[PDB]
Amino acid sequence: SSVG
Amino acid sequence: SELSFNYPNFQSVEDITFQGGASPRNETLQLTPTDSNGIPIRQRAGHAVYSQPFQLRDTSFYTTFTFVIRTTSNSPADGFAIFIAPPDFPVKRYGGYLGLFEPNTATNTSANKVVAVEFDTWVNTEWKEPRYRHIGIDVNSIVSVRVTRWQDKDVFSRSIATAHVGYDGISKILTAFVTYPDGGNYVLSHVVDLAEIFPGDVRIGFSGATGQYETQYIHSWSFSSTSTN
Ligand SMILES: *[C@H]1O[C@H](CO)[C@H](O)[C@H](O)[C@H]1NC(C)=O
Ligand SMILES: [Ca+2]
Ligand SMILES: [Ca+2]
Numbered sequence: 243s244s245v246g
Numbered sequence: 247s248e249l250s251f252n253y254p255n256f257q258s259v260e261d262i263t264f265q266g267g268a269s270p271r272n273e274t275l276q277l278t279p280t281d282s283n284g285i286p287i288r289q290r291a292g293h294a295v296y297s298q299p300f301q302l303r304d305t306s307f308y309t310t311f312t313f314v315i316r317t318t319s320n321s322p323a324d325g326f327a328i329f330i331a332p333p334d335f336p337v338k339r340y341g342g343y344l345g346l347f348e349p350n351t352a353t354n355t356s357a358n359k360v361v362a363v364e365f366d367t368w369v370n371t372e373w374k375e376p377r378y379r380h381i382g383i384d385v386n387s388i389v390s391v392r393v394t395r396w397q398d399k400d401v402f403s404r405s406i407a408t409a410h411v412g413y414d415g416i417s418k419i420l421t422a423f424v425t426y427p428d429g430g431n432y433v434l435s436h437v438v439d440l441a442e443i444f445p446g447d448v449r450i451g452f453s454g455a456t457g458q459y460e461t462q463y464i465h466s467w468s469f470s471s472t473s474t475n
Contacts, residue, residue, distance in 0.1 A: 243372050245341070 247301040252468040266337035268292025275464035277454025291345030295451025307471035323368035323457030342370040345453035355386040
């Protein structure tokens with residue numbers, strides 16, 4: 243994931 | 247119900263409601279914000295909505311708009327959508343949720359009430375997406391029910407593109423045609439009973455999200471709905  | 251409106255440009259925003267990061271700028275609807283130097287602000291979402299609610303029982307509609315995607319890199323994110331949802335629908339999560347979903351429920355169709363045509367610039371790893379930029383029809387999930395390749399030439403063209411979105415309330419079919427001037431054309435259709443999903447009032451509008459290196463602008467918008475009886 244690209245989250246953060 | 248019967249509703250009609252017409253914005254040949256956004257030198258007027260008389261009936262438009264702005265939420266989250268969206269604002270009127272350069273005689274367009276700017277869906278996500280830019281800083282004082284014009285740089286896209288990361289991790290923001292915005293909605294620009296027609297302020298008055300309407301109903302979808304025994305109704306067909308046609309809407310058309312023009313739009314531009316401005317990118318500042320080869321890795322823009324995340325895109326935008328035209329959506330229908332209840333009138334209290336807020337701006338939801340930024341990034342790949344497109345301002346339309348919450349992370350804890352984004353692929354749970356029972357937990358959402360939103361239908362959209364999305365223009366997706368970033369292939370998300372977090373849920374099933376095609377491995378290319380795409381245009382899709384979303385029904386209660388960020389995982390599109392109907393999806394087609396959006397050519398990178400058109401994505402990065404900086405052209406003023408057109409979308410036509412119609413709903414035939416007899417056949418229960420939602421269709422989008424997307425056209426680029428001297429570029430691609432795109433056609434997607436899906437059978438979906440909107441009056442079943444939305445037995446009450448709804449509003450229509452646009453949602454954009456970052457992401458990074460991208461701003462989405464709506465340049466014109468018209469709409470008409472009519473009874474099927
Ligand atoms: C993570 O960040 C990328 C950009 O680096 C995209 O905005 C992507 O959509 C993000 N992932 C999620 C789940 O929002
Ligand atoms: Ca998508
Ligand atoms: Ca995506």
